[PDB]
Amino acid sequence: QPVVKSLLDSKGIHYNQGNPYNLLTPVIEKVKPGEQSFVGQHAATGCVATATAQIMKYHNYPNKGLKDYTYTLSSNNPYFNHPKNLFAAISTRQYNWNNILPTYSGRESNVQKMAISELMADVGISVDMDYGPSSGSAGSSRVQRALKENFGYNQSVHQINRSDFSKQDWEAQIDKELSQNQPVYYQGVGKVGGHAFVIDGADGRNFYHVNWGWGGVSDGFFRLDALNPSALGAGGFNGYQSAVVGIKP
Numbered sequence: 001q002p003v004v005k006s007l008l009d010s011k012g013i014h015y016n017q018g019n020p021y022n023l024l025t026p027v028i029e030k031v032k033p034g035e036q037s038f039v040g041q042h043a044a045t046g047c048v049a050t051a052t053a054q055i056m057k058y059h060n061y062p063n064k065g066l067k068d069y070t071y072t073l074s075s076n077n078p079y080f081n082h083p084k085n086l087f088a089a090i091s092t093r094q095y096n097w098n099n100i101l102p103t104y105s106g107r108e109s110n111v112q113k114m115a116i117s118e119l120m121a122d123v124g125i126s127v128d129m130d131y132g133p134s135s136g137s138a139g140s141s142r143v144q145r146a147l148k149e150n151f152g153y154n155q156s157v158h159q160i161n162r163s164d165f166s167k168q169d170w171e172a173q174i175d176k177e178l179s180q181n182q183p184v185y186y187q188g189v190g191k192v193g194g195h196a197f198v199i200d201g202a203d204g205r206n207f208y209h210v211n212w213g214w215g216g217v218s219d220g221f222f223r224l225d226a227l228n229p230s231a232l233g234a235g236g237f238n239g240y241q242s243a244v245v246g247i248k249p
């Protein structure tokens, strides 16, 4: 396994799902029975958008979006009146990567906060985000499509599924991305739920550096069969693993 220091850390990239990332997500309209309450608050960006946006920032790409996206929230989503149609004008976007900062801590200009929230909302919409207090997406299958179709990333972008590969071939694919300075979109499921995140380094001892998309909480090195961040307190993201690799302009 090669030694690759955290690619996101190298560029100071640390995103999360709340303020100011979520300034343009849909504003919650309704109460889910027994959950008081989130009305009038912006929905979370969703871990899938946060992971994807961090990788996009690593590349500062694209300057210009390619294709718009529209979808309708599931009729089972309790937070919005139905139908709820969302639209991202991605084909018209001129993303100013100078204004989309690698992290946000509070003194950023309105231009800079608009820049990141626009990216987060565009990415979220492109992956059919089921917006809520927390926001869920199918993940890899949506991410690979959005990156190519809407964002104009290389045709090389594709989803890989863990059970489609031997252990050696799986790790070889992740390693190759990291040797090419290409952070990997990754997701898995356990006891605790399913979560998406970024693999962006390797220690040469078969641990991989993970950015969990929680602004830095639990970020560090993990074995792929033990993606068990401290925030779980609680079986980690070790089942139904998939990644999106080949992520480059």
Ligand SMILES: *[C@H](C(=O)O)[C@H](O)C(=O)N[C@@H](CC(C)C)C(=O)NCCCCNC(N)=[NH2+]
Pocket (backbone or CB within 6 Å): 017, 044, 046, 047, 048, 074, 128, 129, 130, 134, 135, 136, 137, 138, 139, 140, 187, 188, 189, 193, 194, 195, 196
């Ligand atoms: C992201 C987060 O903020 O933590 C969240 O974990 C997430 O998106 N999880 C995915 C699981 C994958 C491993 C990414 C998830 O739970 N998806 C459920 C599918 C979409 C939800 N429902 C509908 N109708 N779209």
